[PDB]
């Protein structure tokens, strides 16, 4: 179960956009 | 507003199933949730307790 | 000014008539362990005779403290040690 850093940047920017 | 203290929340539990009289008060039930009907004779001054 | 020494459990105290000779005289008569009784009653009967013996011997101390000072005296006093080996030697001689 590898966690990608680019996925964390994408999730950071997306939760900055709408935060769900 | 620099002064900011912890709010002293007060919990009120009303609408008990039974009401007690002053004559029915016994010392076996201290620290227990009781409801008492009565007539106030006199009231005191609104004074500050030292809480904390 | 030396007025009084506070009393402790000593070698002369165990070697009195009221002491370990009392235990050898009356412990087998007093102590009864039965399988019909439950373990609480058996253990309390073990404690009871020794507690009365402690309250007759050294009443100043509590009973757990009495067992602690008996452990200390049994580790320390040599007269008690030679009495304890004398009991075992006398019973294996017979």
């Amino acid at each position: 179960k590898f966690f990608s850093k680019e996925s964390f940047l994408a999730d950071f920017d997306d939760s900055s956009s709408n935060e769900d | 507003s620099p002064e900011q203290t912890e709010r002293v929340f007060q919990i009120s539990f009303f609408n008990l199933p039974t009401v007690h009289r002053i004559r029915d008060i016994r010392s076996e039930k201290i620290g227990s949730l009781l409801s008492i009907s009565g007539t106030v004779t006199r009231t005191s001054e609104v004074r500050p307790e030292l809480y904390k | 000014r030396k007025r009084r020494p506070q009393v402790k459990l000593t070698a002369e105290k165990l070697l009195s008539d009221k002491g370990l000779p009392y235990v050898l005289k009356n412990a087998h008569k007093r102590i009864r362990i039965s399988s019909k009784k439950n373990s609480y009653d058996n253990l309390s009967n073990i404690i009871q005779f020794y507690q009365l013996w402690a309250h007759e011997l050294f009443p100043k101390a509590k009973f757990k403290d009495f067992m602690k000072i008996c452990q200390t005296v049994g580790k320390t006093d040599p007269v008690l040690r030679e009495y304890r080996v004398s009991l075992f030697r006398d019973e294996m001689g017979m």
Partner: protein, 745 residues
């Protein structure tokens, strides 16, 4: 009057600087006042850093920290600056993601520099406060109040709009992370270390300890409180539930996961290997793994707790007199030696045992009980399982507990192995230079995550135990065993306790992996039990009785694990162990023998000479010898002392104690070890209605052991009356009669 004048001019200058950093911009009319930076304000940040350098560091004072704290620089200046930078950068990132090269910052480098300096002051001001010996008297005077100000700091960090400063800190970290690995300067990795250190400061802040002066005698009033809390700060704000909530809301957990999982491929691991382990330890120092798996349900456990309280209250009011206090009842008891002893009571009138308990309790002389005085707190260490009570429970909520479970599960499934390998790489070269703090946190991190993976694999079969497979390498074996040995030889007892916990969980992991698969398992059980470590684990219980309850419980669990892992080899006989030879073991080698071994196991002769030497120190141990070495009287003394605290403990610890008592009293067959009177008093206390509950499963085997114990006791006293003395005293050592005392001939 130099000292107070210097103090008031220092406080005046910090007040002037705190006014000079910035203002809330009351000129602009917005319903929340936006924070506005002051003119020439980055120089003020450098002046706070210069003041914290020149005064706090070399001159051994802490006046600057409280001078900052009473004027609320962290509360009112640094946090609004970082939160404003975070909100502006988030809005700019949104607008640049939708349309690039539109609406930029005017002075982004200045804002990034002042944000970095604010984060530097957050790390420098929330550093963990340790006061060892030979320190300055200013720090000793100021330690408690500065701990309270750090508690205010932690509450304000976690509570200010649910901790947006954590998002600011991770944004300062991903400023570094966006750069490629080859283009990253070491200053950028030091900024990453700054962010990880900030998170360890946020987690690691705990309430202080209450220190008293014992030169004067303690008065009749005594200690009225040990509360060490600031006015607005409660225990809920400091607790781990708010930490987990603020970390999950601000995505700190994903940041820690994505730096843990790619520690070797993306980041320079030597910069951030130690603060990451410190962060994991500061989560897991106060969390019990059994309570994290819960197995109306709150009301279910509440109803069972009220039933237990009702049964204990019924057993209490059995002793309570039915009449009032002034209703005087005097009882004269007699022994069969004729005497009169008077007791005063109404319940004691009828039954003998309550009357004798009154006669025992009426005495006002108490024996001295010497205390270790808890010298672990003198060292600079956080409160953990080595210091907390065994009955201490962390009360996670549903959402916070689920988020913590998900974070720990993803940590183990992603990067526990890489982090553990990197740390045991770093510490195996820095073994002789690390102070007790890194040893304790390494052993606790290892033991906690091994135990949590063991419990998760036991509860659920979806998880794999091989996810902590890098716990089972030889390097971690050498590191844990050497840490425990060096802790024992230097008489250091905190690291001994942490290594005892780590060795117990290491043996538990080995037992689980051996029970799963039936190989390298014989190699590793030969590796751990080699050298003089069997003597180490043998003499750890002999010295246990002097120390605290948690040390003694770890002695219970370690000895139970040792006997459980060594009783598996009672019939299989595979107990080859590297031993230490004392006198001459020199052998004239034969090169024909060497060459035929070269043909046998395909080896070079230098390492075949190594094998030929190592075969000479190989010995075999007897498990009956291991038991008979464990049966020494101080081991029984410390286990009886551990069984004294039977109200506080759960069923498992006393189950282990009574299993070892079955090992002593049935299997090994020497019974004079348990023929002492403290065990008899304790068994009376446990089997009483005031002690163990009748509905508990512990009382069944306590009653069975006591039945078999009194059966053998009545057999021994019927065969020999002299043992009536022998219950009182420690057992005898004279060889002419000691065989009859121990075994009855």
């Amino acid at each position: 009057n130099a000292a107070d004048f210097s103090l008031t001019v220092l406080r005046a200058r910090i007040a002037l600087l705190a006014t000079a950093i910035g203002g809330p911009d009351y000129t602009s009319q917005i319903d929340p006042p936006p924070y506005k930076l002051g003119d020439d304000c980055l120089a003020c940040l450098k002046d706070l850093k210069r003041w914290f350098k020149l005064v706090d560091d070399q001159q051994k004072r802490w006046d600057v920290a409280m001078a900052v704290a009473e004027y609320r620089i962290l509360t009112d200046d640094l946090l609004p600056i970082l939160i404003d930078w975070e909100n502006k950068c988030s809005l700019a990132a949104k607008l640049a993601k939708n349309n690039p090269d539109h609406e930029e910052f005017r002075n982004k480098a200045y804002y990034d520099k002042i944000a970095l300096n604010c984060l530097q002051l957050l790390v420098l001001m929330t550093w963990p406060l340790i006061v060892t010996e030979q320190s300055s008297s200013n720090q000793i005077t100021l330690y408690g109040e500065l701990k309270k100000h750090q508690l205010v700091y932690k509450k304000t960090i976690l509570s200010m709009e649910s901790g947006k400063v954590l998002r600011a800190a991770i944004r300062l970290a991903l400023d570094v992370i966006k750069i490629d690995r080859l283009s990253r300067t070491p200053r950028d990795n030091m900024v990453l270390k700054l962010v990880l250190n900030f998170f360890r400061n946020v987690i690691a802040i705990e309430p202080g300890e209450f220190t008293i002066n014992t030169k004067k005698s303690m008065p009749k009033k005594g200690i009225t409180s040990i509360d060490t809390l600031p006015p607005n700060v409660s225990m809920d704000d400091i607790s781990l539930n708010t930490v987990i909530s603020s970390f999950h809301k601000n995505k700190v957990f994903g940041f820690l996961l994505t730096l843990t999982s790619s520690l070797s491929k993306e980041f320079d691991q030597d910069f951030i290997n130690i603060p990451l382990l410190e962060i994991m330890f500061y989560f897991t120092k106060d969390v019990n793994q059994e309570l994290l798996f819960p197995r109306t349900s709150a009301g279910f456990e509440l109803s069972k707790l009220l039933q237990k309280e009702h049964q204990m209250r019924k057993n209490v009011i059995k002793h309570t007199s039915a009449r009032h206090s002034r209703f005087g009842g005097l009882l004269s008891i007699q022994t069969p030696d004729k005497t009169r002893l008077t007791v005063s009571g109404s319940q004691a009138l009828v039954d003998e045992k309550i009357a004798l308990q009154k006669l025992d309790d009426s005495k006002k002389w108490n024996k001295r009980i010497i205390k270790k005085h808890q010298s672990v707190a003198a060292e600079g260490l956080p409160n953990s399982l080595l210091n907390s009570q065994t009955g201490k429970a962390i009360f996670f909520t549903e959402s916070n507990g689920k988020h913590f479970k998900e974070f720990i599960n993803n940590f183990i499934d992603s990067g526990f192995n890489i982090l553990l390998h990197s740390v045991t790489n770093y510490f195996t070269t820095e073994q002789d230079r690390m102070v007790t703090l890194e040893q304790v946190e390494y052993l606790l991190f290892f033991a906690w995550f091994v135990k949590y993976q063991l419990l998760r694999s036991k509860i659920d079969n979806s998880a794999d135990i091989k996810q902590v497979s890098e716990a089972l390498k030889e390097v971690t074996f050498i590191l844990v065993s050497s840490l425990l040995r060096s802790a024992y030889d230097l008489k250091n007892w905190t690291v001994t306790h942490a290594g005892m916990i780590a060795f117990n969980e290491l043996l538990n992991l080995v037992s689980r992996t051996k029970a799963a698969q039936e190989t390298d398992i014989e190699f590793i059980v030969s590796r751990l039990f080699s050298d003089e470590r069997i003597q180490l684990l043998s003499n750890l219980p002999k010295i246990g009785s002097k120390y605290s309850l948690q040390f003694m419980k770890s002695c219970i669990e370690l000895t139970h694990s040792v006997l459980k892992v060594l009783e598996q080899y009672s019939d299989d006989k595979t107990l080859v162990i590297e031993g230490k030879s004392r006198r001459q073991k020199k052998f004239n080698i034969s090169e024909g023998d060497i060459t035929k071994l070269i043909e046998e196991e395909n080896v070079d002769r230098d390492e075949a000479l190594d094998i030929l030497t190592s075969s000479l120190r190989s010995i075999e141990v007897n498990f009956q010898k291991v038991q008979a070495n464990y049966m020494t009287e101080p081991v029984i003394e410390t286990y009886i002392n551990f069984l004294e605290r039977f109200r506080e403990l759960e069923d498992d610890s006393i189950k282990k104690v009574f299993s070892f008592f079955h090992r002593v009293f049935v299997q090994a067959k020497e019974q004079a070890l348990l023929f002492r009177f403290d065990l008899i008093i304790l068994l009376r206390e446990m089997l009483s209605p005031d002690g163990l509950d009748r509905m508990s499963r512990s009382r069944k085997y306590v009653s069975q052991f006591s039945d078999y114990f009194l059966a053998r006791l009545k057999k021994r006293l019927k065969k020999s009356p002299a043992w009536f003395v022998g219950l009182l005293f420690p057992p005898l050592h004279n060889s002419e009669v000691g065989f009859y005392q121990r075994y009855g001939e």
